Design a protein around this nucleic acid. Structure first.
Ligand SMILES: [Zn+2]
Length: 252
DNA sequence: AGGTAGACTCGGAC
DNA sequence: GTCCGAGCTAC
């Protein structure tokens, strides 16, 4: 799930779990548990806590309990569902939080790729994976000024910059390509080569792109097809270890 | 010093 | 065998 989908999960899951008390935690794929590293400690500490809130930072969900916060990343295919303990689990269910009311919060992931970290709430923001996470793209904390400052200080491409989680939170590959297209900027441009005007335009398109989605595609996955603005075939390359899609006419 | 690239994790489709 | 995408180690 991308940031807007995670925001949707946050919004929709919260009412379904708030006020419920954990009675058991069952773990079927221990590698998902990153902190405490021992899955038995992870399970033991959450028993008896009540779910109080659900927040989002970038693509991370932060489940707020009584004492602890559970920090969860779904990666590409991770999903949560709330359902009855009396019914069979869905395939690829790796972690289940059992509530005292006979319902469960279940985490599935065919790719077994997601991560879970539990810390005391007051610690979560200064420990991995939230430590160092950049500002929310839709927040005033993500500004053209901030973007420009990171851009001048690096020798990396503008695409590599936008993919950097310390620059801006949870801005996935798809939105990087779409935003760069909308801003008219080639993904392989050195970040420091962007003019002030280009930085401001890129900021504006990043906000618009991810903002509209939180509320269809110009280039991402469209290689070999006509640009929707100029008709030039979309091209695909690799930039910063990601599939990279762009119009060589609209973007400069 | 610390910015930067690589490796690592995973499974399903070409 | 690689392609895909997110987010500790060693130059
Ligand atoms: Zn075009």
């Amino acid at each position: 799930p991308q940031l807007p989908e995670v925001e949707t999960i946050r919004r929709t899951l919260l009412p379904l779990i708030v006020g419920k008390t954990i009675e058991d935690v069952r773990i079927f794929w221990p590698n998902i548990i990153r902190h405490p590293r021992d899955s038995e400690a992870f399970a033991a500490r959450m028993i008896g806590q009540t779910v109080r809130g659900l927040e989002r930072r970038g693509k991370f969900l932060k489940f707020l309990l009584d004492r602890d916060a559970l920090i969860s990343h779904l990666r590409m295919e991770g999903r949560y569902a709330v359902a009855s303990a009396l019914e069979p689990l869905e395939p690829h269910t790796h972690v289940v939080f059992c509530f005292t009311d006979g319902s469960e919060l279940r985490y599935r992931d065919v790719r077994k790729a997601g991560t879970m970290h539990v810390y005391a709430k007051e610690e979560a923001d200064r420990r991995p994976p939230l430590a160092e996470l950049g500002p929310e793209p839709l927040s005033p904390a993500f500004s053209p000024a901030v973007l420009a400052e990171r851009a001048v200080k690096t020798k990396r491409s503008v695409k590599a910059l936008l993919l950097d989680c310390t620059v801006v939170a949870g801005f996935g590959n798809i939105y990087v390509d779409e935003s760069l297209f909308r801003a008219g900027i080639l993904p392989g441009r050195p970040a420091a080569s962007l003019s002030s005007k280009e930085i401001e335009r890129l900021h504006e398109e990043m906000v618009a792109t991810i903002g509209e989605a939180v509320m269809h595609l110009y280039v991402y996955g469209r290689q070999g097809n006509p640009c929707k603005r100029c008709g030039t075939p979309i091209e695909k390359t690799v930039v910063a270890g990601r599939g990279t899609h762009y119009c060589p006419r609209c973007q400069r």
